[PDB]
Nucleic acid binder design. Structure first.
Lengths: 132, 62, 189, 65, 314, 138
RNA sequence: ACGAGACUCUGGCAUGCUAACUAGUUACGCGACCGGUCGGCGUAACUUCUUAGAGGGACAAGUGGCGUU
């Protein structure tokens, strides 16, 4: 019986989406900053909004939230995804290639590449799942 | 008609016509290798013990 | 002091159930002297469970509406017949009490099953709390009927009823109706 | 809020064929500083002041007075 | 460079510890503010059984006590509450001899003058108020003051004229002098709100901090930037060492102890509880302080227990 | 000398004034263990039998009780006594003694330091009782 | 968007605050008991129980687990 109405959720989302810098993790400070930067006509409504704001702060620390979107998160995530390995996972010494794709490459005049190892095709022709 | 004890491990659910039985999994102490499903009447808990008068009888599951 | 009523020993309580003791246990610091602390135990599930047995059983005395909420009479009526029981028996107004209830509570019941089952029932295990609560009511009903239109008065039916329950005799209404219900269930297995 | 945000007025029109009942419900708007409507908002209305755009500082740059 | 090792913990309270007040003139009195609405005394025994049971508890605040400071004498304490009031506690009978009402909202941090005659207080009412020991209103800095909350403000306890440094959530600090209380120096560069500031008892360094995680050092006689002491997030407590050269800042759960000379770490105080079932972050310390001898550290946490660390002698 | 900490139970209340004296306790200007029902005497006597008479041999406590209902008048005497000792010890003597007494009583009974939140609910119309309604006609 | 929720009234907390000689602590023959209970008195401290005002306080907020975490 403690589900939050869309008023509280939406107000918390807007406050978090605009004023991320000011708020923290302690409910007794989120309530004060919220009542400072917002017109909340009731103490109980302010308490509910600040509690959900504290819950949202506990939610974001473990990862980006679906309903929360600010530019700071976008830049932080682009910093996070600024990861490049030492060796490319693509190009290695030996890559297996089937005889048919080997013929396709020799048609393209790239069939003389030495990185290619001509593997043998499947022994049989069992690739359809049984019907029924 | 021997009487033995088994520890509740997972309260599976509540069943009954109007609802009076708690279907629950109990692991025996003296074996710990066999577990059974019993519908206990009355308010039951998790991890407590239950007194069964028949070990060869099981109630309906699911 | 720490003893019940300043006379009943608190240290000679026995486990006597191995692992059912968690629902019948008076051995902790919360075990107070006078069983009267108002009705705050029937406010949440199993907040009654931590209550000592003496308290709930003296609470269960007030029935029939004429004597509803007369917990002073209940505590007096328990103190009397406790100062009697052990006296006539000899053990410990407590140990006898736990033994009597354990002997008066049913262990297997019959419940209907299915969405539309209307012919047969099935045997089911009984949980500690359910049997104890029922047994206390049975004991109280036996005391009431031994004090209803009978030569015996209140605060005295409980003593001999508890003595019979500890003895395992068929004299007490509690175990005799327990056996009747058990026979019904056995025919209904 | 219906106590102060809604004004109710019931009246009767007398006509040759009968009597017409007229009920009117009006909702006053959020009108502070003039009291034509209520000075207080709807209790479910939460307003957030827009963030102020300021130059983010890089180094301490102060001037003596 | 000495390991900082817990000696004997203390428990037995029902709220966070928000401020620890220590005096250098008595080696036994040390105050504790706790948001159970109280202020607590300690009598340190330095023994293995327990670090002692508190002697006196003082209750006078309708809301949490935010910051408490002691005077040159240990028989008078000054405590501001979250309700916008200040109380002058006299220890001779365990009651408050005076209660001052000058603010209207939570006074965050309170300070005291060098001679213990001025009372400078800052609250989330976007104002700073300077009174005397009699409670008569002397100065109210509202015009061209902080445009946000004033989280902390302290004096300059040096032989020169006392000078007040107030930090706010406007990401700017402001420095004033008691002679006329006119705007002279505003310090910028912070990109976040400033929580607490502390000046060494020489009028030469002034360290701030907060969610930004970087501590700014300011020279009282110059007022220009010196260097950056980076650290963890949420710098709640900053305090120098009176008997040593250690500035301790509780940057998040951990405590960073820097030196004013090389501005490098002395010992990273790593804390960890080992458990197979653990999905909660460790409790965060709120206040740091030194003893009168400056050799044992008190850390008031959010865990309703103060952690006390001795020097390892090595 | 005086803490006047009071104590509540239903609409009834009890005020236990504590002072430095012989250690003897008086309730309603009367000695302790002669209350007329003699049924809940140990219920209000619990503090002595729990914390010991020595803890009760250095404080003079006069308790006055006012409020409708005789069972409501009792159940606040002992809470007022415990709160009076706690307040007196915290105000005057030290913390540790009050800490031990409060810890022991709380480990025994939580109700001895906090008041009862229960109170008589109003009665809504359409029925004879508070929740109950009148008998329907079918 | 209406309804729900929020909201108005009511109670569970205020030794923090404004306070009364109609209700009242703490206060010495007067009214008395081998150093203590006694609605008959008056100003002193100025509010704790008493009344009602500003506030504050509770938010599933803090931990453990379940949950498409």
């Amino acid at each position: 019986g403690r589900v939050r109405t869309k008023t509280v959720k939406k107000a918390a989302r807007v406050i978090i989406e605009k004023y991320y810098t000011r708020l923290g993790n302690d409910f007794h400070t989120n309530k004060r900053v919220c009542e400072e930067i917002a017109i909340i006509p009731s103490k109980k409504l302010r308490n509910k909004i600040a509690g959900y704001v504290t819950h949202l702060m506990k939610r974001i620390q473990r990862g980006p939230v679906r309903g929360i979107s600010i530019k700071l998160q976008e830049e932080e995530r682009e910093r996070r995804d600024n990861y490049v390995p030492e060796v490319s996972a693509l190009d290695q010494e030996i890559i297996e290639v089937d005889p048919d794709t080997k013929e396709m490459l020799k048609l393209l005049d790239f069939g003389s590449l030495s990185n290619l190892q001509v593997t043998q095709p499947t022994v049989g022709m069992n690739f359809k799942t049984p019907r029924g | 008609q021997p009487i033995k004890l088994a520890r509740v491990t997972k309260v599976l659910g509540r069943t009954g016509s109007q609802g009076q039985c708690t279907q629950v999994r109990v692991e025996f102490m003296d074996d710990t290798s066999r577990s059974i499903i019993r519908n206990v009447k009355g308010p039951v808990r998790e991890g407590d013990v239950l007194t069964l008068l028949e070990s060869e009888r099981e109630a309906r599951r699911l | 002091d720490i003893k019940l009523f300043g006379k009943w020993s608190t240290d000679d309580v026995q486990i006597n159930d191995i692992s059912l003791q968690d629902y019948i246990a008076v051995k902790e610091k919360y075990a107070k002297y006078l069983p009267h602390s108002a009705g705050r135990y029937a406010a949440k599930r199993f907040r009654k469970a931590q209550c000592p047995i003496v308290e709930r059983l003296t609470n269960s005395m007030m029935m029939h509406g004429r004597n509803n909420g007369k917990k002073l009479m209940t505590v007096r009526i328990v103190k009397h017949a406790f100062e009697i029981i052990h006296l006539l028996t000899g053990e410990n107004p407590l140990q006898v009490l736990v033994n009597a209830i354990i002997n008066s509570g049913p262990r297997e019941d019959s419940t209907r099953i299915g969405r539309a089952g209307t012919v047969r029932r099935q045997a089911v295990d009984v949980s500690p709390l359910r049997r104890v609560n029922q047994a206390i009511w049975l004991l109280c009903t036996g005391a009431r009927e031994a004090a209803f239109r009978n030569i015996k008065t209140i605060a005295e039916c409980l003593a001999d009823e508890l003595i019979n329950a500890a003895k395992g005799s068929s004299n007490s209404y509690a175990i005799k109706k327990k056996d009747e219900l058990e026979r019904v269930a056995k025919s209904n297995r | 809020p219906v106590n102060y945000y809604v004004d109710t007025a019931v009246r009767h029109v007398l006509l040759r064929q009968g009597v017409l009942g007229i009920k009117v419900k009006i909702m006053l708007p959020w009108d502070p500083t003039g009291k034509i409507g209520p000075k207080k908002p709807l209790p479910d209305h939460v307003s957030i002041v827009e963030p102020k755009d300021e130059i983010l500082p890089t180094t301490p740059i102060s001037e003596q007075k | 460079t000495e390991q900082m090792t817990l000696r004997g913990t203390l428990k037995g309270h029902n709220g966070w510890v928000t401020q620890i007040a220590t005096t250098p003139q008595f080696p036994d009195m040390i105050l504790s503010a706790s948001r159970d609405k109280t202020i607590i005394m300690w009598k340190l025994t330095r023994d293995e059984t327990n670090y002692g049971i508190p002697q006196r508890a003082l209750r006078g605040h309708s809301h949490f006590v935010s910051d408490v400071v002691i005077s040159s004498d240990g028989q008078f304490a000054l405590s501001g509450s979250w309700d916008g009031t200040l109380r002058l506690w006299d220890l001779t009978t365990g009651t408050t001899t005076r209660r001052f009402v000058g603010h209207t909202k939570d006074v965050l941090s309170v300070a005291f003058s060098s001679d213990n005659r001025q009372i400078v207080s800052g609250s989330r009412d976007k104002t700073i108020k300077l009174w005397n020991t009699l409670g008569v209103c002397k100065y109210t800095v509202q015009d061209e003051s902080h445009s946000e909350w004033v989280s902390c403000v302290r004096f300059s306890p040096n032989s020169s004229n006392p000078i007040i440094v107030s930090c706010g959530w406007d990401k700017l600090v402001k420095v004033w002098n008691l002679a006329n209380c006119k705007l002279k120096t505003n310090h910028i560069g912070h990109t976040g709100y400033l929580n607490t500031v502390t000046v060494s008892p020489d009028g030469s360094l002034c360290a701030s901090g907060g969610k930004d995680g970087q501590a700014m050092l300011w020279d009282l006689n110059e007022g220009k930037h010196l260097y950056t002491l980076d650290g963890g997030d949420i710098i709640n407590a900053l305090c120098f060492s009176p008997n040593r050269y250690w500035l301790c800042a509780a940057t998040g759960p951990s405590i960073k102890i820097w030196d004013l000379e090389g501005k490098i770490i002395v010992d990273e105080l790593k804390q960890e509880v080992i458990s197979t079932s653990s999905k909660a972050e460790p409790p965060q310390c709120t206040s740091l302080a030194w003893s009168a001898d400056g050799q044992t550290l008190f850390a008031g946490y959010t865990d309703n227990l103060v952690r006390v660390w001795q020097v390892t002698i090595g | 000398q005086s803490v006047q900490v009071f104590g509540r139970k239903k609409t009834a209340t009890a005020v236990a004034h504590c002072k430095r004296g012989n250690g003897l306790i008086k309730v309603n200007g009367r000695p302790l263990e002669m209350i007329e029902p003699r049924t809940l005497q140990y219920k209000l006597l619990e503090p002595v039998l729990l914390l010991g008479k020595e803890r009760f041999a250095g404080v003079d406590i006069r308790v006055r009780v006012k409020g409708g209902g005789h069972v409501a008048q009792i159940y606040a005497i002992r809470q007022s006594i415990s709160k009076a000792l706690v307040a007196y010890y915290q105000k005057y003597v030290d913390e540790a003694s009050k800490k031990e007494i409060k810890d022991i009583l709380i480990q025994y009974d939580r109700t001895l330091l906090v008041a009862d939140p229960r109170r008589c609910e109003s009665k809504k119309f359409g029925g004879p009782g508070a929740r109950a309604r009148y008998q329907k006609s079918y």
